[PDB]
Design a protein around this ligand. Structure first.
Ligand SMILES: CC[N+](CC)(CC)Cc1ccccc1
Ligand SMILES: [Mg+2]
Ligand SMILES: [Mg+2]
Ligand SMILES: [Mg+2]
Length: 328
């Protein structure tokens, strides 16, 4: 019991078709085991449940971005994730794409897929959205090497260090930046940076990564992963696994409560700032984007085959992928 309500975009089926063609055309997913395994994740349902405001090509972008995140993530479940210098170099290649240097023809599948997601994301976007989201991507790519450092250390970090690494490797605020973009809204800066919306944005991202930590612990613990809230709590408190899971549930619940308490202040905040009716509408949609990411991510993770299937399809005795698609 995380304390989250149940959630979908009507573009689910069209996006399923588009996204299957996209991952195969780009070389992220092959034929056979990799395609079956990818399909079992149900990236279209994650997009439709996590981004219910997205329609048409906007939902396509959400599903393709998710596909990139998950395929790229799994490439570190192998030697790359025990090699911080190599991880830092591979991730520097991707960061160069973020800051404007496109990969060119014949780039590897991960570079090509990311370049496509990023170009589609920024096309027609407000410059303030582009600048913020570019730095979000930089954090995401740069954090991976620190997760590898922690694996070599073999102990979980303290809570502060766990949050600094885990917020990065989880994709930081990128799901919410994507949801804003896909909903076609631009949050007014005066509202975006209110203490209420800053705390809410941070809480929503923490909620989803902590919910994921609980559901993905089984597939991660056996690989020597250290940046998982359950392991962090257990190590810090010297408590039982059950006590640590219970505490993790409470960390999520307290953040949901804080989010909802602050959400109640948002109508009055928009009035204090003198926002226009359209601006208030965009803020209201942004609240729904955050609410839907929290509830939709969790709904998806209860139905996907990624977490129950991984230890059997890709046991910890081998890499967490069928094909190497990321040159190192
Ligand atoms: C955002 C997608 N992600 C992290 C990059 C792919 C592995 C899983 C994830 C989803 C939701 C919360 C935390 C992690
Ligand atoms: Mg990861
Ligand atoms: Mg992972
Ligand atoms: Mg996980």
């Amino acid at each position: 019991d995380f304390g989250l309500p149940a959630p979908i975009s009507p573009g689910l089926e069209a996006t399923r078709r588009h996204n299957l063609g996209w991952v195969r055309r780009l070389g992220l997913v092959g034929d056979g085991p990799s395609l079956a395994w990818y399909t079992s994740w149900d990236m279209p349902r994650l997009a439709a449940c996590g981004f219910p405001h997205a329609r048409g090509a906007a939902l396509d972008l959400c599903a393709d971005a998710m596909a990139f995140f998950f395929v790229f993530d799994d490439q570190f479940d192998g030697p790359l994730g025990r090699d911080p210098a190599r991880a830092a170099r591979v991730c520097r290649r991707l960061t160069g794409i973020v800051h404007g240097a496109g990969p060119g023809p014949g780039a590897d599948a991960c570079s090509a897929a990311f370049a496509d997601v990023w170009a589609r994301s920024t096309d027609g976007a407000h410059p303030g959205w582009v600048a913020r989201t570019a730095h979000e991507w930089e954090y995401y790519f740069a954090a991976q090497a620190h997760e590898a450092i922690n694996r070599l250390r073999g102990t979980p970090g303290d809570m502060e260090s766990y949050l600094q690494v885990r917020r990065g490797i989880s994709g930081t605020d990128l799901p919410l930046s994507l949801g804003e973009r896909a909903a076609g809204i631009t949050v007014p800066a005066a509202a975006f940076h209110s203490p209420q919306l800053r705390i809410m944005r941070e809480a929503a991202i923490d909620v989803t990564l902590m919910c994921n930590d609980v559901y993905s612990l089984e597939k991660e613990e056996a690989r020597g992963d250290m940046d998982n809230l359950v392991l962090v709590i257990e190590h810090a408190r010297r408590c039982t696994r059950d006590e640590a899971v219970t505490a993790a549930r409470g960390e999520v619940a307290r953040r949901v409560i804080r989010f909802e308490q602050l959400a109640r202040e948002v109508p009055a905040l928009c009035a204090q700032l003198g926002l226009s009716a359209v601006e208030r509408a965009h803020v209201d949609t942004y609240l729904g984007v955050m609410e839907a990411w929290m509830s939709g991510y969790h709904a998806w993770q209860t139905q996907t085959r990624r977490y129950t299937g991984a230890p059997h399809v890709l046991p910890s005795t081998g890499p967490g992928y069928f094909d190497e698609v990321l040159p190192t």
